[PDB]
């Protein structure tokens, strides 16, 4: 583990300090369908012509990123992704830019989001939820060892692969920080109290978000919901959680320690760090090595119909890609 993480960091740091740039070009890909949208572009299913490999290409309109003041966040995202390498993180295959846009070509993960299956089925059994929770526990131990805070855990951002294992996507808010940080970002249901209250905060916000996730998986709804974000915030800072009567007592206790307002008491945030979580009774049946190596059988394998099938994703209205004749925001994105 220590020795895993030592090698992981050496590996990461080389790429961190010398980021890969300009490793493909748009005209090498055949565009097929939109798998998702966002405030600065979309993710499209695409085909790499030279190989016949399918990928998910994220396109960001440089002008939109600038307007929304997300330049630094966007350079974080690319610089981190090109440098990390973990089984439960979607791989960045290529990245490039043109006059108008930024492009991040990711590994295509055809099983769709946990969100979809979670909403459809209603809720996951404790074993089913424990299985995905353990993959996140290891993923955060990997990312936090690298000084990386993730900051957007939610079922919408966890993709299910062909083996029924999770792949974390969307690094738009990930940041390499040694001390504390202040940006208000993330998703309302998943924000730790520190964030809402404009305190400086650190990685402990990822562990809190883990408690929100685990609870959502196992209850079928989040511990703090309302029709408007400000009503959600009050619920979160009051730190009053009710559990479904079906919740096992081990689960209720883990959740009490994860969704802990007092940072000297929050699991992940103490002298033993991540082992508080890994050693908790709820996880007693978890074989950590076998999860990492993917030899545990998944509770659920997605229905697969083809290499480039898209039915596990919602439909989205297409929009043509226009590339301007003039370079936009060149200086802002020169390191991209």
């Amino acid at each position: 583990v220590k020795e895993f993480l030592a090698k992981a960091k050496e590996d990461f740091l080389k790429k961190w300090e010398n980021p890969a740039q300009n490793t493909a070009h748009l005209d090498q890909f055949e565009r097929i369908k939109t798998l998702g949208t966002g405030s600065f572009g979309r993710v499209m299913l695409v085909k790499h012509m030279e190989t016949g490999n399918h990928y998910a290409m994220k396109i960001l309109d440089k002008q939109k990123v600038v307007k929304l003041k997300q330049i630094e966040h966007t350079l974080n995202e690319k610089r981190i992704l090109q440098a990390v390498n973990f089984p439960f993180l979607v791989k960045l295959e290529f990245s490039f830019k043109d006059n108008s846009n930024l492009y991040m070509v990711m590994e295509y993960v055809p099983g769709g989001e946990m969100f979809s299956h979670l909403r459809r089925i209603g809720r996951f059994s404790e074993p089913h939820a424990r299985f995905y929770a353990a993959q996140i526990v290891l993923t955060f131990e990997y990312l936090h060892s690298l000084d990386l805070i993730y900051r957007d855990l939610k079922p919408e951002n966890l993709l299910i692969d062909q083996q029924g294992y999770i792949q974390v996507t969307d690094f738009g808010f990930a940041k390499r920080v040694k001390g504390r940080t202040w940006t208000l970002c993330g998703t309302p249901e998943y924000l730790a109290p520190e964030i809402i209250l404009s305190k400086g905060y650190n990685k402990a916000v990822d562990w809190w978000a883990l408690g929100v996730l685990i609870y959502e998986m196992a209850a079928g709804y989040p511990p703090f919901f309302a029709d408007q974000p400000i009503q959600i915030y009050e619920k979160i800072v009051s730190g009053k959680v009710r559990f479904p009567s079906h919740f096992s007592s081990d689960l209720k206790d883990l959740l009490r320690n994860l969704l802990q307002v007092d940072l000297t008491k929050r699991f992940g945030n103490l002298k033993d760090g991540v082992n508080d979580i890994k050693n908790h009774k709820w996880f007693a049946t978890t074989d950590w090595i076998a999860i990492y190596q993917r030899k545990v059988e998944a509770p659920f394998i997605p229905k697969f119909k083809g290499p480039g099938d898209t039915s596990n994703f919602d439909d989205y209205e297409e929009e043509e890609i226009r590339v301007s004749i003039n370079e936009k925001c060149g200086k802002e994105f020169s390191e991209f």
């Binding site: 929304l68 966040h73 738009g172 808010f173 970002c185 309302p188 709804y221 919901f225």
Partner: peptide, 20 residues
Amino acid sequence: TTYADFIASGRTGRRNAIHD
């Protein structure tokens, strides 16, 4: 029920990130 209160709320679709 809490489930019923959830299902009837405006937040059962995909949830957008906030920032600033």
